[PDB]
From Swiss-Prot:
This is Proto-oncogene tyrosine-protein kinase Src. Residues 1-60 form the SH3 domain. It is found in: Cell membrane; Mitochondrion inner membrane; Endosome membrane; Nucleus. Non-receptor protein tyrosine kinase which is activated following engagement of many different classes of cellular receptors including immune response receptors, integrins and other adhesion receptors, receptor protein tyrosine kinases, G protein-coupled receptors as well as cytokine receptors. Participates in signaling pathways that control a diverse spectrum of biological activities including gene transcription, immune response, cell adhesion, cell cycle progression, apoptosis, migration, and transformation. Expressed to high levels, and with a high degree of kinase activity, in certain fully differentiated cells such as neurons, platelets and macrophages. Isoform 1 is widely expressed. Isoform 2 is expressed only in the muscle. The chain holds residues 82 to 141 of 533 of the full protein. The phosphorylated form is termed pp60c-src. Forms a complex with polyoma virus middle T antigen. Interacts with AFAP-110. Interacts with GJA1 and PXN. The lineage of its organism: Eukaryota, Metazoa, Chordata, Craniata, Vertebrata. Belongs to the protein kinase superfamily. Tyr protein kinase family. SRC subfamily. It comes from Gallus gallus (Chicken).
Length: 60
């Protein structure tokens, strides 16, 4: 199923595989919410990559 989140803070990409996002973006994960880093897709930007769980909160 869909598992969505909204970003609470801006995050700047620092690796080859993470995802930059801004506060307020809607983000979905492409596996489960286990662990601290999730492969995600931004509904806002269309970009993808790993995001840190502690920058986002659940969004229905």
């Amino acid at each position: 199923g869909v598992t969505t989140f909204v970003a609470l803070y801006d995050y700047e990409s620092r690796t080859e595989t993470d995802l930059s996002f801004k506060k307020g973006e809607r983000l979905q994960i492409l596996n489960s919410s286990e662990g601290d880093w999730w492969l995600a897709h931004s509904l806002t930007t269309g970009q993808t990559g790993y995001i840190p769980s502690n920058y986002v909160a659940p969004s229905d």
